[PDB]
Amino acid sequence: HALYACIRCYA
């Protein structure tokens, strides 16, 4: 939703 959120998600 938040690109910071996004990255976490694939991290």
Numbering used by the authors: 2 to 12
Please share excerpts from the published article on this structure.
The mixed chirality α-helices are superimposable onto the homochiral α-helices and form under similar conditions as shown by CD spectra and MD simulations but non-hemolytic and resistant to proteolysis. These direct observations unequivocally demonstrate that the α-helical fold with only natural residues can sometimes tolerate multiple stereochemical inversions without significant conformational changes.
In all four individually resolved homochiral bicyclic structures, the peptides were present in almost perfectly superimposable conformations featuring nine of the eleven residues forming two full turns of a right-handed α-helix including the pair of stapling cysteines (ESI†). The two N-terminal residues and the N-terminal toluoyl double staple formed a turn conformation. In all four cases the α-helical fold resulted in an amphiphilic arrangement of hydrophobic and cationic residues corresponding to the helix-wheel model and explaining the membrane disruptive activities discussed above.
